[PDB]
Amino acid sequence: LKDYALEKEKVKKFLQEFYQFKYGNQLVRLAHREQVALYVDLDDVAEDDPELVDSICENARRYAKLFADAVQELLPQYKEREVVNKDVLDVYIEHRLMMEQRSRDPGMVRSPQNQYPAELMRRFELYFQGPSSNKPRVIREVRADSVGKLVTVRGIVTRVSEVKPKMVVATYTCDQCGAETYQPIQSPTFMPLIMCPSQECQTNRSGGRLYLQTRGSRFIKFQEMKMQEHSDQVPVGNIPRSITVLVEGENTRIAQPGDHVSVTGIFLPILRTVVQGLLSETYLEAHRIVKMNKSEYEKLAASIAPEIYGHEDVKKALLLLLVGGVDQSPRGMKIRGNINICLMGDPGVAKSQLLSYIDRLAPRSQYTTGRGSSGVGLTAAVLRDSGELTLEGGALVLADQGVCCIDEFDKMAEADRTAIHEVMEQQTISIAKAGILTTLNARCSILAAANPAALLSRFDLLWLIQDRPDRDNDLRLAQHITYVHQHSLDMKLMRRYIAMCREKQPMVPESLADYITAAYVEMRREAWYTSARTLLAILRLSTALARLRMVDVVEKEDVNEAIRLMEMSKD
Amino acid sequence: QLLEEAAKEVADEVTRPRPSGEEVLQDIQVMLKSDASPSSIRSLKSDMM
Amino acid sequence: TVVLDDVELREAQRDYLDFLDDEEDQGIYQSKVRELISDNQYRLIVNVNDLRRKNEKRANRLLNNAFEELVAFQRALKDFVASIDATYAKQYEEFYVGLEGSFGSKHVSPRTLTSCFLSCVVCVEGIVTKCSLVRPKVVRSVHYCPATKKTIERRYSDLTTLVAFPSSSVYPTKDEENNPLETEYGLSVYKDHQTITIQEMPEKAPAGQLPRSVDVILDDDLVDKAKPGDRVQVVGTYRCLPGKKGGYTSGTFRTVLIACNVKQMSKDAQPSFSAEDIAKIKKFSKTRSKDIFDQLAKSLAPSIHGHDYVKKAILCLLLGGVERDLENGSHIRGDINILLIGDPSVAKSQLLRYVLCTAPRAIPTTGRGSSGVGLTAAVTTDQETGERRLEAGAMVLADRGVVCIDEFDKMSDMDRTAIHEVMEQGRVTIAKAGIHARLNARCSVLAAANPVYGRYDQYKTPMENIGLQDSLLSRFDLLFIMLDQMDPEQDREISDHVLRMHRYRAPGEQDGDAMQIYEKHDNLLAFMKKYIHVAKIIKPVLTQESATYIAEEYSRLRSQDSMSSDTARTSPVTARTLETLIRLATAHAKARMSKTVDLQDAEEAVELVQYAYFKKVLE
DNA sequence: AAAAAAAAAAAAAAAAAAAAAAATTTTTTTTTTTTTTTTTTTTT
DNA sequence: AAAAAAAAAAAAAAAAAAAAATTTTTTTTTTTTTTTTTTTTTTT
Numbered sequence A: 001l002k003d004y005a006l007e008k009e010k011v012k013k014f015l016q017e018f019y020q021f022k023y024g025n026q027l028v029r030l031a032h033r034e035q036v037a038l039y040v041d042l043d044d045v046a047e048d049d050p051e052l053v054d055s056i057c058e059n060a061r062r063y064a065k066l067f068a069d070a071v072q073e074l075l076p077q078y079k080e081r082e083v084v085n086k087d088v089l090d091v092y093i094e095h096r097l098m099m100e101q102r103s104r105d106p107g108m109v110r111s112p113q114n115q116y117p118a119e120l121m122r123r124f125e126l127y128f129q130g131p132s133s134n135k136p137r138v139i140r141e142v143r144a145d146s147v148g149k150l151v152t153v154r155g156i157v158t159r160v161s162e163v164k165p166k167m168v169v170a171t172y173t174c175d176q177c178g179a180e181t182y183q184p185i186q187s188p189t190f191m192p193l194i195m196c197p198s199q200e201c202q203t204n205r206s207g208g209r210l211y212l213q214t215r216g217s218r219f220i221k222f223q224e225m226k227m228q229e230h231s232d233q234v235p236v237g238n239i240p241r242s243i244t245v246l247v248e249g250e251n252t253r254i255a256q257p258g259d260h261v262s263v264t265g266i267f268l269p270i271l272r273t274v275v276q277g278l279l280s281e282t283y284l285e286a287h288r289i290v291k292m293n294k295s296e297y298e299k300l301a302a303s304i305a306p307e308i309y310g311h312e313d314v315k316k317a318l319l320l321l322l323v324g325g326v327d328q329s330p331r332g333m334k335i336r337g338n339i340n341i342c343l344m345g346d347p348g349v350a351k352s353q354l355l356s357y358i359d360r361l362a363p364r365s366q367y368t369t370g371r372g373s374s375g376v377g378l379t380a381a382v383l384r385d386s387g388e389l390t391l392e393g394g395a396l397v398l399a400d401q402g403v404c405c406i407d408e409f410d411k412m413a414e415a416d417r418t419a420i421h422e423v424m425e426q427q428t429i430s431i432a433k434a435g436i437l438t439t440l441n442a443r444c445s446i447l448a449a450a451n452p453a454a455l456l457s458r459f460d461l462l463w464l465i466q467d468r469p470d471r472d473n474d475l476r477l478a479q480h481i482t483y484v485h486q487h488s489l490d491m492k493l494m495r496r497y498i499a500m501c502r503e504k505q506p507m508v509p510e511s512l513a514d515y516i517t518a519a520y521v522e523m524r525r526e527a528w529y530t531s532a533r534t535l536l537a538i539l540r541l542s543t544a545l546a547r548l549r550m551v552d553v554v555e556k557e558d559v560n561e562a563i564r565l566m567e568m569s570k571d
Numbered sequence B: 001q002l003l004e005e006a007a008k009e010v011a012d013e014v015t016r017p018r019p020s021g022e023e024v025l026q027d028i029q030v031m032l033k034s035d036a037s038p039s040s041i042r043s044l045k046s047d048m049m
Numbered sequence C: 001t002v003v004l005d006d007v008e009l010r011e012a013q014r015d016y017l018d019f020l021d022d023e024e025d026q027g028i029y030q031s032k033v034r035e036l037i038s039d040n041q042y043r044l045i046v047n048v049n050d051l052r053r054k055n056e057k058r059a060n061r062l063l064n065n066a067f068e069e070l071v072a073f074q075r076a077l078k079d080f081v082a083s084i085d086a087t088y089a090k091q092y093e094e095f096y097v098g099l100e101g102s103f104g105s106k107h108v109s110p111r112t113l114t115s116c117f118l119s120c121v122v123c124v125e126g127i128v129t130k131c132s133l134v135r136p137k138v139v140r141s142v143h144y145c146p147a148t149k150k151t152i153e154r155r156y157s158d159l160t161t162l163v164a165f166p167s168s169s170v171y172p173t174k175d176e177e178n179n180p181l182e183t184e185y186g187l188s189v190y191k192d193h194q195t196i197t198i199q200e201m202p203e204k205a206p207a208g209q210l211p212r213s214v215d216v217i218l219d220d221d222l223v224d225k226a227k228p229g230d231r232v233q234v235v236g237t238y239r240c241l242p243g244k245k246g247g248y249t250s251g252t253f254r255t256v257l258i259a260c261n262v263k264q265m266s267k268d269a270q271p272s273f274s275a276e277d278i279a280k281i282k283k284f285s286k287t288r289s290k291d292i293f294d295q296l297a298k299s300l301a302p303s304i305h306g307h308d309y310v311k312k313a314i315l316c317l318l319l320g321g322v323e324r325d326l327e328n329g330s331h332i333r334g335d336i337n338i339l340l341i342g343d344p345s346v347a348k349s350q351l352l353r354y355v356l357c358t359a360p361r362a363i364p365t366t367g368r369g370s371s372g373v374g375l376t377a378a379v380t381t382d383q384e385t386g387e388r389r390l391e392a393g394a395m396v397l398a399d400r401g402v403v404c405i406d407e408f409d410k411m412s413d414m415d416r417t418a419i420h421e422v423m424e425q426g427r428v429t430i431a432k433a434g435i436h437a438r439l440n441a442r443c444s445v446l447a448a449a450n451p452v453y454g455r456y457d458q459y460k461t462p463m464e465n466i467g468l469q470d471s472l473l474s475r476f477d478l479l480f481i482m483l484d485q486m487d488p489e490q491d492r493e494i495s496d497h498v499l500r501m502h503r504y505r506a507p508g509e510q511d512g513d514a515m516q517i518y519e520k521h522d523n524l525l526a527f528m529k530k531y532i533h534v535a536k537i538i539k540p541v542l543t544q545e546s547a548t549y550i551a552e553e554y555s556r557l558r559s560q561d562s563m564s565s566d567t568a569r570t571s572p573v574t575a576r577t578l579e580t581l582i583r584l585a586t587a588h589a590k591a592r593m594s595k596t597v598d599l600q601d602a603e604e605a606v607e608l609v610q611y612a613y614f615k616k617v618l619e
Numbered sequence D: 001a002a003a004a005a006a007a008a009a010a011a012a013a014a015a016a017a018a019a020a021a022a023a024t025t026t027t028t029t030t031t032t033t034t035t036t037t038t039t040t041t042t043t044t
Numbered sequence E: 001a002a003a004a005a006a007a008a009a010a011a012a013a014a015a016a017a018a019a020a021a022t023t024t025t026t027t028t029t030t031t032t033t034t035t036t037t038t039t040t041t042t043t044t
């Protein structure tokens, strides 16, 4: 073991002196209260001292306390101006330290338990981000031996509670004296107080009768999130293990249901309270949250799943949706910029694989086959939580903004079919069922796959794939896939280009009005099922193609390629 | 007892910058006296209790 | 609930391990460790002034909060004595730390042992009052189950001062299977335990006030170091005791003083020497061995004039003869006893006070101050057990020591006869119906009687003029007659001496306000104690020449012709006078460090008796 | 010098103070196991 | 389209667990008091 006064001196000199003053700029910003959270980096601390880093890895919580108090004492010399007191909480802390100065009597000694505590008066928070040397360990493998140890984990989210105010330091005021006592909370529960240990009360022999209130207290942004093993992490036959993670301060509202996360934290226990001993629950106290691995033209479309061959126009339309047609809300009525595709196909052309690649691709994606997600799996339902009937979502509401890759749409349940019709038509999901009376909001885009009328009449593109056996086509595809087995754009760069492409917002020009109306009527005569939905289809595809070009104005080239795609699909 | 701790507080502040060891504020007894005539030991009835 | 580390304990143990580490210094505490290891004693006495000079703050801390501090000290002691010898350090489950030195503010008396000194090692002088039976206390108790062939060792913590729980105090008697357990007394481990009671000395205490006393719990290592009546300085931890369990408490906390050590406050067992002093004594003996008795005799009792024969005789007393215990226990004494009889203002009482201040274990007895049962021993019942205990008297306290009898003439005949067996055989055979014993008081007696009529009449015979029986004057072996001649010439002598001593001052130490072998020869005018102390042990056997000469001179003294007419005997010449001759000869030889009593010492003894006994009554 | 009288000592017995010693099941809560009812999802 | 299997939610009951709780009496100890013996001291 060591001496933690020495450790605090070590980290104080470190935080002052390491680098542009890397940590110094952060310190002065939080001193002025231009940031509320701080993040230590064990790579940046292994830059000089490895023993301290190994100790942090092995007993991280204590050093968290050390670092935070060290920065708290470094605060005022870095402070340089009068902050504007942006919060009533700021008013309280300023008033508190003001009256402490007023009745200071600096020579006068005060007890070891008569002082405003750090956890109350800090007003900032300090977290970490574990070193690259620290391998992220399997959620199953983070056992009792790793309690207190600093540990990073990578897992999928299943469900996440909302931001409700956890208590940090309850504040009580008296009925006679007027002092203000604190109960610093740590655990899931606290017994309230009813008597005031203020020395005026001890002198008076008065009934304390202090009353808790929220005004002088210190709440915090608290969430309990769930996480689940990676299906690749899971062993041969066991189901994926879960884990509970606790999210505080400026770590709140990062992860969301369905999004992969990497959380860096410590695996601390709670009291369990039927075999003897002293049992205890386990929660991982998050200290850095980073979404990762899903939610961080011609060559581009060919880059969309290079392992598939042919279907070039299909890939181009897939790229187009991934860019997304322009979102419009003109005159109240919504004209959503979603693009809905269905792939009817002969048995086996890698349509499921295309859906899986889009699932791996999009920043929000949910790949649902027939019956694994049915009823509540696609819809939203009710569950016990602060215990409560928390209404949470299924696949589509998880994919509220993204892409639902629905597989085998032909054989879905009829309720699932009805819900998907609703979401494609109006991007809501109305429910008036047994214990649910809601209208979920689901701004999702549908990629249906199926095997061979309502489909044709409610969509923006249907594609029939008939692998008519052509010798040269099959020869080239066979060479291609055999080469794939033989040898076994980057996804991140592709997704970056798409992400930037999402936000150019073109507005249609007047020059193309005659062209688009003429093309619409001509397509109608060539038909004589097409209608206003197909008009909106060509128009959305034109907007999205302008987005792909990145210009803010749609042109004749865009509409030409749109008609090219739709002609290829229909034929 | 109020007088006793009052004496204690004023004592610590007057001797305030004390040296090592002698810092825990020691208890300050407050004995009394007067100038009035003492009353006889036979005059302690119940009412003067 | 084992402590991983404490900065306080680690710091204190490091400091005291340094304090014990004595090689770069002179090696004093290392030598103390080595000698106590050689002795098998297991307490080491650390001087508080040493601790203060090396680290004042630790001295302040320890003298303010003892027990845990001394736990640190004793753990350091165990580690240190293990480094010197691990085998011996393993031998004793604990080693202890006695104290010594200038406990400046921490020196009070039991009247002044206030409630400010709790858990502080207080220093306190005082007289013992009680001596409880030194009885065992069990510390580690072993048991044997014969049904299950099992052995157990219950363990006890000496919570004489802290809180104690029944779970700690259980003495097991049955196993888990309700079998019978038989104690293994020998395999168990015990420590002695005694209570005593120190008291404020009546010479120190306030004159008109009741005594005040403090209770002292001597555990092992300090069993018999304090009997009733002794002067003792106790240094140790005043604390509080736990009331036994019970839902109520008054605030009362009867307090004790768990003594850290106790030493003889008499400070008269003082053989403190150095090798240089031993060599000094050796040369002082051997260079001028033949004149050394007269050197010592003239030296002894400065601040008084003449009386050279009496100084020689008091030397013969203090140096002592040699006690003899023959084959069958016929114990022939080896002490001198002197009766000063002489006119008033002859410094007889001043000689008595000199030997009181100098001779180790000297004690004063007045005529009607001490009386019989006080003088010799006594037998009294306990009243707590109805058993007869023995209360040692003045003489028994003065066993192998000196008693100064002021105004011996005034002791009534009962006590004057009660002193008989102590005078001859140096024992008091006391007995009442329950208990009897022969207490041993090998005492020596210097007794200053005064003459009948208040002053010696020259013409009257000494036997008429002394109000003491021939019976007793036999037992006394020398009777010295001190007359005030009143001549102006010797008056000039004595007067100049006396007023010179009135003019002698503390050299330099004083300004005008009132309160080495040889001495720096101050014109106006320690090693005495050193040399006489070493002198006492030697047993100089009598030579054939000395025995024949002393025998013939005794025969001459017995014969009436040896005294001329007009002289009157002062003490009849019984065989006690011959034994006096032998004892005085041995005392002279012991002065010389002879290893044999020779004719020189024999003729000195015969000169002594011839001057002392036969007196010239004038007409 | 020995007898008589008085004083003190030794030892047993009693009165109060204050610290020790002894006695000592029954009613309420609440988790867990089991059953029951209304509803939704699925199958004939 | 009707039947039925399953699901979640709600409730009852039995087993285990939770919680509440000073007063009276006895015995050692200390301290004096009283008796009787022993001792010492004064008298003829």
Ligand SMILES: Nc1ncnc2c1ncn2[C@@H]1O[C@H](COP(=O)(O)OP(=O)(O)O)[C@@H](O)[C@H]1O
Pocket (backbone or CB within 6 Å): A306, A307, A308, A309, A310, A345, A346, A347, A348, A349, A350, A351, A352, A353, A354, A449, A477, A480, A481, A484
């Ligand atoms: N060009 C290609 N690249 C990679 N895989 C291919 C290709 N052509 C065919 N496949 C294979 O076809 C198989 C069936 O695809 P699948 O997604 O099941 O289509 P569907 O589910 O629509 O029938 C996949 O296992 C895939 O490996």
Ligand SMILES: Nc1ncnc2c1ncn2[C@@H]1O[C@H](COP(=O)(O)OP(=O)(O)O)[C@@H](O)[C@H]1O
Pocket (backbone or CB within 6 Å): C303, C304, C305, C306, C307, C343, C344, C345, C346, C347, C348, C349, C350, C494, C497, C498
């Ligand atoms: N031999 C002496 N030498 C010097 N001074 C003497 C001598 N004898 C007596 N004195 C003086 O006479 C005083 C007599 O005191 P002290 O001895 O108490 O009385 P006493 O002699 O009657 O016992 C002493 O203080 C001392 O100063």
Ligand SMILES: [Mg+2]
Pocket (backbone or CB within 6 Å): A351, A352, A407, A408, A449, A450
């Ligand atoms: Mg498929």
Ligand SMILES: [Zn+2]
Pocket (backbone or CB within 6 Å): A173, A174, A175, A176, A177, A178, A179, A196, A197, A198, A201, A208, A210
């Ligand atoms: Zn209050």
